[PDB]
Amino acid sequence: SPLPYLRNCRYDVCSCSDGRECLCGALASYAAACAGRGVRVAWREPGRCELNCPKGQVYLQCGTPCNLTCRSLSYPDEECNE
Amino acid sequence: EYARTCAQEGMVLYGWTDHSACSPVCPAGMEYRQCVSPCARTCQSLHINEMCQERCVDGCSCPEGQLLDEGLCVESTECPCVH
Amino acid sequence: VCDATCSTIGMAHYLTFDGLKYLFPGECQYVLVQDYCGSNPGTFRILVGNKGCSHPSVKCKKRVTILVEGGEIELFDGEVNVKRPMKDETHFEVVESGRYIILLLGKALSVVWDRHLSISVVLKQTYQEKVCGLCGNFDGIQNNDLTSSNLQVEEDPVDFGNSWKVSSQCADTRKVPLDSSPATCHNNIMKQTMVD
Amino acid sequence: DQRVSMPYASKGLYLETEAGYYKLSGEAYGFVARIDGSGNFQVLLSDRYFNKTCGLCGNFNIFAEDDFMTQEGTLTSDPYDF
Numbered sequence: 543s544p545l546p547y548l549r550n551c552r553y554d555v556c557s558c559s560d561g562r563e564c565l566c567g568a569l570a571s572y573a574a575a576c577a578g579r580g581v582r583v584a585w586r587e588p589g590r591c592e593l594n595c596p597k598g599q600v601y602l603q604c605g606t607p608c609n610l611t612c613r614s615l616s617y618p619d620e621e622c623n624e
Numbered sequence: 625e626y627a628r629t630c631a632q633e634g635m636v637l638y639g640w641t642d643h644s645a646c647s648p649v650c651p652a653g654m655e656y657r658q659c660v661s662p663c664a665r666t667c668q669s670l671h672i673n674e675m676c677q678e679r680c681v682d683g684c685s686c687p688e689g690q691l692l693d694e695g696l697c698v699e700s701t702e703c704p705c706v707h
Numbered sequence: 708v709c710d711a712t713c714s715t716i717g718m719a720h721y722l723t724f725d726g727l728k729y730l731f732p733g734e735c736q737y738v739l740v741q742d743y744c745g746s747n748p749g750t751f752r753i754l755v756g757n758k759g760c761s762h763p764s765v766k767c768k769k770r771v772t773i774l775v776e777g778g779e780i781e782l783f784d785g786e787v788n789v790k791r792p793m794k795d796e797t798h799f800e801v802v803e804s805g806r807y808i809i810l811l812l813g814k815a816l817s818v819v820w821d822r823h824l825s826i827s828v829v830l831k832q833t834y835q836e837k838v839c840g841l842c843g844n845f846d847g848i849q850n851n852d853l854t855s856s857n858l859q860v861e862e863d864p865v866d867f868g869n870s871w872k873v874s875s876q877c878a879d880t881r882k883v884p885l886d887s888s889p890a891t892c893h894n895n896i897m898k899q900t901m902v903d
Numbered sequence: 904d905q906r907v908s909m910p911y912a913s914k915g916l917y918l919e920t921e922a923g924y925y926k927l928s929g930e931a932y933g934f935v936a937r938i939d940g941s942g943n944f945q946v947l948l949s950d951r952y953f954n955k956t957c958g959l960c961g962n963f964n965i966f967a968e969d970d971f972m973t974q975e976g977t978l979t980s981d982p983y984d985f
């Protein structure tokens with residue numbers, strides 16, 4: 543139920559110094575809470591802080607941290623259930 | 625109409641439609657029961673007697689089994705859960 | 708372990724036995740609290756019926772019917788009617804005081820009514836996880852109070868409320884959007900600050 | 904002006920399918936209307952409206968001979984004028 547997260551977002555936006563970051567970190571907290579129940583939400587847009595991570599990167603939604611880095615190649619037998 | 629008004633006068637006449645050869649139209653599955661209980665038996669219903677004892681009214685209901693589920697008679701075994 | 712009281716705060720808010728407040732604007736008749744719960748024998752089946760109060764307004768009639776040990780009492784328009792009489796009339800005692808009617812329905816079950824809209828059923832430790840309805844099971848644990856009639860916990864009060872609807876052919880309450888200013892404070896910020 | 908679902912419960916009117924027939928009850932106002940499958944209408948007015956009702960069903964007085972009162976307040980004998 544998104545009521546507590548609503549109260550949290552209003553408080554964060556009014557009180558903190560930079561309302562942009564606080565809003566985009568409160569929506570993200572709610573989205574993480576929802577995705578902890580199986581429901582993935584696509585809330586990022588050009589008006590809602592879509593992550594601009596470095597040039598050699600790209601934004602995803604259901605990533606695979608099993609093989610993202612390449613220490614995993616150095617330790618292949620190592621479990622990656624994630 | 626002659627039945628219904630006669631029913632409203634306090635003496636409901638039973639089984640006049642056996643050989644009338646005309647029957648009221650009703651949704652598929654249900655038959656025109658003369659003096660059916662207004663208190664249905666929907667699958668998701670709390671079993672609260674003595675609180676659903678209104679006056680009987682003529683109308684059509686499911687067969688002897690086949691509890692209601694959103695206006696569609698289904699056998700009592702297949703009552704769907706809701707969440 | 709002390710006593711415990713439900714409460715129908717206002718016109719669409721409920722306060723369960725374990726101190727959980729929630730919002731459920733019904734229109735039909737619901738099971739406020741009952742003892743015919745699970746494999747228990749059970750004795751009483753208090754019911755509350757709303758009329759014209761999905762939107763809390765100045766019509767908002769309510770009527771409670773108590774089906775305790777046979778005969779059933781009912782409270783309406785600031786009056787108590789004993790439609791059918793309790794078989795152990797030694798227990799029944801409708802004491803009236805102040806602006807309230809206090810009904811003593813036995814030893815552990817009592818009811819307090821303020822003649823208009825506030826209704827509060829009071830239990831002693833006799834029941835202690837033997838009841839259910841719109842007031843939860845009264846077991847000290849506040850998390851599991853929204854167990855619907857299907858013995859499952861619902862995350863939304865309206866679902867858990869419609870689960871207790873007595874007549875399964877009347878209207879389910881709609882999932883109203885979540886906003887602070889319900890109806891008339893919607894765009895009247897002046898009135899919003901006034902009521903605040 | 905807008906199509907609504909069914910059952911409906913606003914404003915003290917309860918509109919629901921009972922016994923397969925659409926029903927519109929207003930017991931606060933003391934009336935119950937009903938429509939069956941073929942399209943017949945049926946209105947069950949209360950008793951508080953005795954000698955008070957005034958419509959196409961005639962006034963609700965026990966007499967059955969003066970039931971053609973027009974809106975002008977004058978009894979007629981041709982059903983179409985009434």
Ligand SMILES: *[C@@H]1O[C@H](CO)[C@@H](O)[C@H](O)[C@H]1NC(C)=O
Binds near residue numbers: 954965
């Ligand atoms: C009904 O009201 C009319 C007009 O006032 C009166 O003439 C008549 O006697 C009344 N009938 C009954 C049954 O009260």
Ligand SMILES: [Ca+2]
Binds near residue numbers: 725843846850851
């Ligand atoms: Ca509980």
Ligand SMILES: [Ca+2]
Binds near residue numbers: 970
């Ligand atoms: Ca007449």
